[PDB]
Swiss-Prot record, chain A:
Gene3D superfamilies: 3.10.450.80
GO biological process, one term: translation
Cofactor binding description: Binds 1 zinc ion per subunit.
NCBIfam families: PRK05767.1
GO terms under cellular component: ribonucleoprotein complex; ribosome
Chain positions of all zinc fingers (C4-type): 11-74
Protein name listed in UniProt: Large ribosomal subunit protein eL42
UniProtKB/Swiss-Prot annotation, chain B:
Gene Ontology MF terms: rRNA binding; structural constituent of ribosome
Name this protein carries in UniProt: Large ribosomal subunit protein uL2
InterPro entries named in the record: NA-bd_OB-fold (IPR012340), Rib_uL2_dom2 (IPR014722), Ribosomal_uL2 (IPR002171), Ribosomal_uL2_arc_euk (IPR023672), Ribosomal_uL2_C (IPR022669), Ribosomal_uL2_CS (IPR022671), Ribosomal_uL2_dom3 (IPR014726), Ribosomal_uL2_RNA-bd_dom (IPR022666)
GO CC, alphabetical: cytosolic large ribosomal subunit
GO BP terms in the entry: cytoplasmic translation
Presence of keyword Ribonucleoprotein: yes
Quaternary data: Part of the 50S ribosomal subunit. Forms a bridge to the 30S subunit in the 70S ribosome. Interacts weakly with protein L37Ae.
Role this protein plays: One of the primary rRNA binding proteins. Required for association of the 30S and 50S subunits to form the 70S ribosome, for tRNA binding and peptide bond formation. It has been suggested to have peptidyltransferase activity; this is somewhat controversial. Makes several contacts with the 16S rRNA in the 70S ribosome.
Family, as annotated: Belongs to the universal ribosomal protein uL2 family.
Swiss-Prot record, chain D:
Positions of Zn(2+) binding: 19, 22, 34, 37
Protein known as: Large ribosomal subunit protein eL37
A Pfam family reported for this protein in Swiss-Prot or TrEMBL: Ribosomal_L37e
GO molecular-function term, one example from the UniProt record: structural constituent of ribosome
RNA sequence: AAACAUCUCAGUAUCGGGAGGAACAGAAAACGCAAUGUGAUGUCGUUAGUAACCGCGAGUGAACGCGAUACAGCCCAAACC
RNA sequence: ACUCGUACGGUCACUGAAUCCUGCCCAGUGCAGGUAUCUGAACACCUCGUACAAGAGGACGAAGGACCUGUCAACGGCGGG
RNA sequence: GCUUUACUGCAGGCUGUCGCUGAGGACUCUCACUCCGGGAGGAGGACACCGAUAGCCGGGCA
């Protein structure tokens, strides 16, 4: 589907309607220092490593919308529930 | 499954061992302090159970009686010599260096003084081709060019008993008798005639190998069977 | 002023440097030809020996023991095992090489008792340790106020029961506080979890 | 040939005999080892924890 | 664990080596109710199924302290001779 | 162990006396050889990060793989129109 | 019990790296180490072996 790059809507921070900019959430890089990262190293040994021996699940036919809504004035963003969309493109 | 036959071998049980106690002598060159003054006389020509070829008993000037790898054309009474100054005649042993090229040799040492390793079976021979103050190129019966230390001692002539392979065994019984003198399990059952549990080629409603016969060099024992690391197969091409 | 002993010690802090280096490069050659347990007239590290209880005296013996380097020499499983227990290559023993050495020595001298031991180096495939043993039956020792303690019946085969210094550290008994919940008073009384 | 009764006829070989150490007829005269006390194999007397129930 | 691989059964069964009438431990490079505080070590009661672990599933699981029992504190190496 | 052995050896396989013979197929799988370029781990090395460290990235790149070739008395195949 | 391009692992083989390990991306040497030689000495040589680790293959085995 199609979607405006910018549009007016409520900003939960300003507590008043303003122009927001919509953008897709770019994945952040892991640090490899979270507790789970330490358990992986600690608990993996000789033989099967339980949960750590498992591999990536799969894919649903269509993914939900993963967007960031940035308030055009206060500069802060907020998240919204997403909806299934085979494809999502912005207008301007 | 069960360990394959090739694996039972290594344990060295009776069935796989050679009848060592029935063997005569470990054919090796003599150890001369130096000089060559070492000569002996052929006293008798005996049969060597370990090689199916003749061997000669020799008495040396210094009272030493030892069997020796007999080349073709050596008779009782003949005088043999072993040393740097050895004469250049059949049956004499001397370092590759002192040997003239184009002369067939047998029982060649891989390392000077190791007693001889190459060219020792019925009728085979090595061919000394090149010399040098360093390398002595010899052509072994397999056809390979082997660079050797000229100080390596060898014996002039081709090994006795040549042509043994020309006559067919004709019957199982003959194979049997020869086999009994070797460290070998015989007769041979085909893998494909076995059960899955006994060999990688076993099993099936009919006999045929399960997979392709060419196996990797890295294959483990219990699996390395069939055509080991074959660079090619068949006759074609 | 510094004791002469302090010099032997200071040298052994870097067995790979200086004169000690060249010295080892030479000795090991002879050592690699000696047996598994060689009795020696004098400790290679006097300061260490004396520090551990040694004494130029009757009934005091020293022996250099050689032991292979590396993990456990283990045979693979010949029956069903869950993946966790199918290992062979990474398994290491719970007894350190120094204790193995102390035991091989004590067995060689059935009448003697282990007093202590220390390292004297290693090449690429083995480690050497010098062990100090004592004759609990020689009167020269039964009358020594600083050693007669090892003469008591309850000190019999002390090395095989982990009562040695290396035996006690290896048993995780160094710490008196946190971390030694499953080690003291013994590994066995703590259900073998330390 | 039956592996039962007919094969029982060839049994006239003496193996296990009275043991010099323990007195049991378990001394294998071919192996010179007692299957009962370990004589010929061990200085210590043969014994195993499985010879009784684990808690006994 | 209603399958099963980590986990669990379990450091159990069993095996190798060894001591004693009891073993082992033991006079802090401790503790850390953080203190102007405690004062070798075992063990019993408790702390507590708590903290902690764990396909964070099923399961697993202490310690300090406290109340008791019994109490006991010493010898070398080196310096200088 | 083979081996008191050394290629006229002995190991690993297939077929199964003699006689007349044994065609076509290397795409897949296997084995083997080569390989500009691509891919390819760890240590050491370089950058960032951290008064250190975790960590992130880069350079280099072995066997192996991609890619190319040889091979069917190697697994096997020898159709529709 | 058996099979395999089922899942997960474990031996084994190949390969890199560190230790043993030394003198002057290609090279010489000798002194460790290895092998031949009864010995003198020869060959090989900082490699190989062995210890550690990493990648690949891996129903041979669980
Ligand atoms: Cl989206
Ligand atoms: Cl034959
Ligand atoms: Cl002892
Ligand atoms: Cl307190
Ligand atoms: K289990
Ligand atoms: Mg694992
Ligand atoms: Mg021989
Ligand atoms: Mg033939
Ligand atoms: Mg035979
Ligand atoms: Mg057959
Ligand atoms: Mg059948
Ligand atoms: Mg099979
Ligand atoms: Mg057939
Ligand atoms: Mg067939
Ligand atoms: Mg106790
Ligand atoms: Mg029966
Ligand atoms: Mg279950
Ligand atoms: Mg469950
Ligand atoms: Mg537990
Ligand atoms: Mg505590
Ligand atoms: Mg005093
Ligand atoms: Mg040798
Ligand atoms: Mg299976
Ligand atoms: Na851990
Ligand atoms: Na088959
Ligand atoms: Na002893
Ligand atoms: Na532990
Ligand atoms: Na169940
Ligand atoms: Na089941
Ligand atoms: Na778990
Ligand atoms: Na209190
Ligand atoms: Na093909
Ligand atoms: Na092909
Ligand atoms: Na079955």
């Amino acid at each position: 589907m199609q979607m405006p790059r910018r549009f007016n809507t409520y900003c939960p921070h300003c507590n008043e309607h303003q122009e927001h900019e919509v953008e897709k959430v770019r994945s952040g890089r892991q640090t490899g220092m979270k507790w789970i990262d330490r358990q992986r190293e600690r608990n993996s040994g000789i033989g099967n490593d339980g949960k750590f021996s498992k591999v990536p699940g799969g894919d649903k036919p269509t993914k939900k919308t993963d967007l960031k809504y940035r308030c055009g004035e206060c500069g802060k963003a907020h998240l919204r529930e997403g909806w299934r969309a085979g494809r999502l493109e912005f207008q301007e | 499954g069960r360990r394959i036959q090739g694996q039972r071998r290594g344990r060295g049980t009776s069935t796989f061992r050679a009848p060592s106690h029935r063997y005569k002598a470990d054919l090796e060159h003599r150890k001369v302090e130096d000089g060559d003054v070492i000569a002996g006389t052929v006293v008798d020509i005996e049969h060597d159970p370990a090689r199916s070829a003749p061997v000669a008993a020799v008495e040396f000037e210094d009272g030493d009686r030892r069997l020796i790898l007999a080349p073709e054309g050596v008779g009782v009474g003949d005088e043999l010599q072993v040393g740097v100054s050895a004469e250049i005649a059949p049956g004499n042993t001397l370092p590759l260096a002192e040997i003239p090229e184009g002369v067939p040799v047998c029982n060649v040492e891989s390392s000077p003084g190791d007693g001889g390793k190459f060219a020792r079976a019925s009728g085979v021979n090595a061919q000394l081709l090149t010399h040098d103050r360093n390398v002595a190129v010899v052509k072994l019966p397999s056809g390979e060019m082997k660079r050797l230390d000229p100080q390596c001692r060898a014996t002039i002539g081709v090994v006795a008993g040549g042509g043994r392979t020309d006559k067919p065994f004709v019957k199982a019984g003959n194979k049997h008798h020869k086999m009994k003198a070797r460290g070998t399990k015989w007769p041979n059952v085909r893998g494909v005639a076995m059960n899955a549990v006994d060999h990688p080629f076993g099993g099936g409603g009919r006999q045929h190998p399960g997979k392709p016969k060419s196996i990797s060099r890295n294959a483990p024992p219990g699996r390395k069977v069939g055509d080991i690391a074959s660079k090619r197969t068949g006759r074609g091409g | 002023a510094r004791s002469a002993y302090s010099y032997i010690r200071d040298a052994w802090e870097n067995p790979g440097d200086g004169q000690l280096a060249e010295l080892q490069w030479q000795r090991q050659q002879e050592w690699r030809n000696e047996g598994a347990v060689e009795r020696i007239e004098r400790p290679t590290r006097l300061d260490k020996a004396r520090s551990q209880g040694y004494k130029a005296k009757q009934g005091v013996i020293v022996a250099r023991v050689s032991v292979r380097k590396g993990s456990a020499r283990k045979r693979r499983h010949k029956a069903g095992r869950r993946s966790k227990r199918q290992g062979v290559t990474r398994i290491t023993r719970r007894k350190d090489i120094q204790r193995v050495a102390e035991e091989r020595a004590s067995r060689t001298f059935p009448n003697l008792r282990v007093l202590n031991s220390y390292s004297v180096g290693q090449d690429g495939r083995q480690k050497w340790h010098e062990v100090i043993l004592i004759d609990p039956n020689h009167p020269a020792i039964q009358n020594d106020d600083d050693l007669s303690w090892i003469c008591a019946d309850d000190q019999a085969d002390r090395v095989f029961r982990g009562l040695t210094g290396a035996g006690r550290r290896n048993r995780g008994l160094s710490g008196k506080g946190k971390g030694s919940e499953k080690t003291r008073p013994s590994l066995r009384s703590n259900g073998g979890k330390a | 040939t039956g592996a039962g009764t007919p094969s029982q006829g060839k049994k006239n070989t003496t193996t296990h005999t009275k043991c010099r150490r323990c007195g049991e007829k378990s001394y294998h005269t071919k192996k010179k080892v007692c299957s009962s006390c370990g004589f010929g194999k061990s200085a210590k007397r043969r014994d195993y924890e499985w010879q009784s129930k684990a808690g006994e």
